[model samples]
Target: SGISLDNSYKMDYPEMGLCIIINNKNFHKSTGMTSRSGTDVDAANLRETFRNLKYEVRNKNDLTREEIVELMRDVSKEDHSKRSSFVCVLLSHGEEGIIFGTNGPVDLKKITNFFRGDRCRSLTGKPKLFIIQACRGTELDCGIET
Candidate 1:
């Protein structure tokens, strides 16, 4: 037996959609959390790459669990009538499926559920991207963190 890896990456030149936030503070003290210095770095990277393609990047940082849910719910109701695609990336720390506010675990599913296909008719059939960076129990990697 042996191990292997892949490095195939590509983007369609131009894209569009929104992004999400779940962290903006350094909890390296009270929560045994890692430095958000890395988190901010990634957000900047996403904004630069995607916005360069054709997406409009917006910041929704420094939010609690409730705020994040309301934000996503509100986002689904927005005038996405003009865009052909939707993209969202959650930058934070937790159990891969969770984002901790102030270094506390926040449910990730609730936020995503708000934009289910049946719930977002406007975005139906259109391209949709959801990027959630966190540690799952253990399985595989689909580059969501990228």
Candidate 2:
């Protein structure tokens, strides 16, 4: 999975903050697919790139749902008074509205709902960007690709 940051956009914030969470467990194992060695590699590279760009980057790997929630809670606490822009990246195995933690599954909506503007007042009027990388279904190729 590739994330392109080539597009330029204007923002009111003086600086941007980024958070990355990588959940690679059970993805390749459950799907019977070979692991993507590049996934973690890409994450590391992206984290460094963002850090080099002066973004406050928080990166983690192989976290369960509870751990993810706790981490987000910590982030919320830290940024509560900053009035800064925020971004979250979630890489995991998913189907529909569910995403897999290292040991099991979790509701995608439940995780994101915590960051709702009305729920998290500190993030109000700020961008709560979420980048999700997962497959929505088990549908195989229909042989349409030329």
Candidate 3:
């Protein structure tokens, strides 16, 4: 017998009504958390790409947890009752279930909950997408050359 590995997952890009992209390029040294530069660049590029696709994209960089919440509040003010979809992307340094805001940490669920079906009546029956890019643990990988 031989060992086997499964590497398949879901891959679907649903059309969204409102798109929110957040990029945190830096972190406070006191927090001892940081993200790779590529993450910031990628986030910016993705924002522009979504914009080009005619999506109403909201991009935020270096925001604190409170600021993120504020942005959500502002978006909720929109009349999305007729919208068909929604999307959100978060990039930063974080641990499992947590994302780093500019000043501190915030729960990923708290952010997503804003657009949930039951919580946000305006976005009911629409898809709310959240793409998070961050480290979940303090581990490093060292590879050997062939």
Each model's lDDT: 0.67, 0.68, 0.76
Which 10 consecutive positions of candidate 2 have the poorest summed lDDT? 25-34
Ranking by lDDT: 3, 2, 1
Q: Count the backbone clashes (under 3 Å) in each candidate.
A: 3, 0, 1
Instruction: Give residue 85's error in model 3 in angstroms.
Output: 1.0
Model 1 misplacement above 4 A: 1-15, 21-23, 27-34, 138-146
lDDT agreement of model 1 with the native? 0.67
Estimate TM-scores for all models.
0.71, 0.73, 0.76
In TM-score terms, which candidate is top? Answer: 3
Q: Which ten residues in a row have the lowest lDDT in candidate 3?
A: 6-15
Better of 2 and 3 by lDDT: 3
Candidate 3: regions farther than 4 A off: 1-16, 139-146
**lDDT for each residue of candidate 1 in 1-146, tens digit (9 for 90 to 100):** 56655343223324355554344545536677666667777778888787776787776666656666777789888866667677887776667567766546667777767677888887776666777776766677687663
The collision pairs in model 1 are 96-134, 96-135, 100-104
Q: Write the per-residue lDDT of candidate 3 for residues 20-52, one digit (tens) a residue.
A: 888888777777766457876787788788888
